[model samples]
Target: GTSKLKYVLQDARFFLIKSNNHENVSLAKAKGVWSTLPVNEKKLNLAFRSARSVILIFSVRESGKFQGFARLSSESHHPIHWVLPAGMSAKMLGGVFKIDWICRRELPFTKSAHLTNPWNEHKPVKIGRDGQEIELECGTQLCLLFPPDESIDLYQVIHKM
Candidate 1:
């Protein structure tokens, strides 16, 4: 069967980045990760990452809205599973979603950007330290990658065993 990459689903996993969760909220606020700009009281940052590999970057609102979606790769001993936003969920249709999420021999950024830092399209992200907090300054640019909805399903993929 035709596939986006030569790699298979058996090699990778899936994760979702969440907002509104108590733990995440506390961390974001305390660490200043994905915090709003200093001048305006508006949210400038939409996403960030932890000091681990296979991070899930997402854009979410306190109202339980799914704003955007993206996947992050960091250097770690093992793969990490990120959580999705509140009231929103991502269901893997099958192995195809797995392949789409993991296999990326062509697009190097999907793999090479693996670091403990946040990223936006506009600027380059610096490498972060363990337990360090990083934030991206653009929300609209990051949020534009995902559609605003309650659920994001990988239904377009059809893999025959």
Candidate 2:
């Protein structure tokens, strides 16, 4: 039987919101910032807005392992209307390795990912679009996608593994 109380919820997620500027991203990295929030509560609304590309990192604990998704929303407004499904690259070895992912979104409310781009090795990779490929310091590219089995009533975005 599922509990009907929100006060007993224990699910929590960490978020790291950064501006589109490289300096701001760099500073956050250097400072090792870890901002977190619990999404299990009722009437929860988390928002971060600025006239720049926003980097949102979602971290959650699963089986005592730290795993999460990093999302780059192009617009600085509500209802981040668009997103893409990008490729993921993980570090193979421990001796100086790297990890990444790429995400994209369609033009509008469509679930299909029409625009796509490859991660640049030298420069930051950006979000993919009709003519522009959004770049990020880390080579990973990704988009918000939902699984086929989940119901829309629960607004949970499934992460690709």
Candidate 3:
């Protein structure tokens, strides 16, 4: 009784054409800023790009329920991709915190992620990635990784958790 449709069906070239149009619009807002004048008047034309590093980690339940479960992880490893704004330091996140799973897709197919930098000591810690949205806490080094089950399809794009 699997009734879920995996992908949208379209009629040949026409289908992709329509998809491309939406992609183009999304890309303009995400990756394109070269032709437009600066809103801040700084003339600092900038667009950041990063490789998606896939990591998977898992742990057993404390109560010893179903042995254990799987976890997944990844990060936007870009020079300019920052998890927090310039003014917001990592210390500010030590209090109550919420991990924002921000995602943006553009034409030509790319996923933009708002990830905490692994190199930073002050960024929020990723508690785990459960095949969907990432988990975040405070006082964590995002780069350093743990371990997860290798049998599961961790890299595949599943629904948000």
Candidate 4:
């Protein structure tokens, strides 16, 4: 009789998404300014788009903490297609990030992300897809990530030591 859902869900994992612009900066330093991808397209595609009851997280610059998250919606599962945002810097300016995800394992439908290069500080980080703007919020979507009560410190745990 396994009534504990935590133990029941076997393949669940917390996928952390970060921009190429972070290593130690964190949220306070970033206010949405076109961050590059952390990993290449395939790995990100293989990992995130294929997950079930997935909870996709957006890290806070590089504070070792996360800011926002996207749960794989039943309506929009596996929907995040990525491409370059117009001009890319060649001299280690590297490149910029753009997105829309692949839904249905290799099918149609997608959720595209918006960037503020396209404002009001707080308004910069919001994500919209085919519908409109959606939050990091979820309903049937399972969220398995936990941050420290002191998540400003990042991750879940209190460091008294």
Candidate 5:
């Protein structure tokens, strides 16, 4: 593969699937670990780790500027995981997962962003935290990353929660 990394995200073992049922509603489960970190914290994790198997959520205001961001890292401990890169794709961003849910909130000072699915881009949203509802509000984001060896799933959900 031309990609710098190899296959890391695996099956339902260490890498589990998670879904948001409430959508925009804020709750406790949504206030989990990743929901507490500030915008800069989340950004630093991604920028530092440079995670190959990670999930990135960002909120873009109506003006087209990034207001917030979140990232989750895969902790492959018990189960196993596989980290695959955007291989075989000639385009830089091509064959890569890029999902951005452009949604608006009642707050004039901020905008709420959701999980943008990028499974079709060869890099699907690897399920690390199954059935975990994390809250993300205006000017917020979350990211998930899994190592190739399946150590642990790193989930960084953030918001006012």
Candidate 6:
């Protein structure tokens, strides 16, 4: 196993996971937590088969909690489980992934992001507390990092609830 500090996701591809069901938001941070999500692996092998990591943002609808982020770290050899999220179905090939390391940071304004809309890329939306804002949206975001600060924020994350 590799050290947590060593899985530098400097150029990792980001995926936003907005869950409508009980996607086990809390368990996502547990060691070896696996989750079924809609994703494109061919894109990742391009970025991850040879990079540091592949990232996903866990967001719960209604609860609207951005339950931190996770990575298929370099430690797991970028492991990808070809299974489904609601567990699965026969004759159907689906996929899931294990979080090599789930980010361990909480927000300043406790509770949920209650992440609101304007929910588009780079839009400064309300989060955490009143007057607090970050260029984040509430939905499935892909490679939506804002270089100067957004991705930098991940190196030290606070994604919600």
Clash counts per candidate, in order, are: 6, 21, 4, 11, 35, 1
lDDT of model 1, residue 68: 29
TM-score of each: 0.21, 0.19, 0.16, 0.29, 0.19, 0.46
Per-residue CA lDDT of candidate 4, range 1-161, in tens?
Answer: 22222332234333434544443123313321223243333343354345443334454332433344433332211112222235743332313323212110110012212222121232322322211221333211212223212213211111100
**Cα deviation of 136 in candidate 2 (Å)?**
22
Ten-residue segment with the worst summed lDDT in candidate 1? 92-101
Pick the lDDT winner.
6
The lDDT for every candidate, in the order shown, is 0.27, 0.23, 0.20, 0.29, 0.24, 0.40
Predicted candidate 2 versus true structure: per-residue lDDT over 36-124, tens digit per residue: 11231111122223212233332121211112223322211111111112341222111110111111111121322332333323321
TM-score winner between 2 and 6, please give it. Answer: 6
Quote the lDDT for 124 in model 6: 30
Candidate 6 regions with alpha-carbon error over 4 angstroms = 1-7, 37-46, 74-93, 105-121, 124-161
Candidate 4 — which residues are off by over 4 angstroms?
1-10, 20-39, 72-161
Positional deviation of residue 70's Cα in model 5 after best superposition, in angstroms:
2.0
Candidate 3: C-alpha RMSD to true structure equals 18.7
lDDT of 6 by residue, 7-117 (tens): 344444455554444435555554445443223433443544654455655555555445555666432222322223564642232234455444444322123234443
Badly placed stretches (over 4 Å) of model 5 are 1-18, 23-30, 33-53, 58-69, 73-161
Question: Candidate 4, after superposition: displacement of residue 146 in Å?
Answer: 4.2
- Residue-by-residue lDDT tens digits, candidate 1, 1-161: 22322122222222324354444433433332332212211111111132122223332334233322323321111111334355643342111111112211112223323332343332332222211223432222222223333333333322321
Alpha-carbon runs more than 4 Å astray in model 2: 1-20, 34-55, 58-161
**Number of the top-ranking candidate, with TM-score as the measure:** 6
Question: Which of 1 and 2 is the better model by lDDT?
Answer: 1
lDDT of 3 by residue, 36-154 (tens): 11221111111111112211211121211111111112211112122443575544321211111112211111111233423233232222222222222211112122122233342
Q: Stretches of candidate 1 above 4 Å error?
A: 1-11, 20-61, 76-161
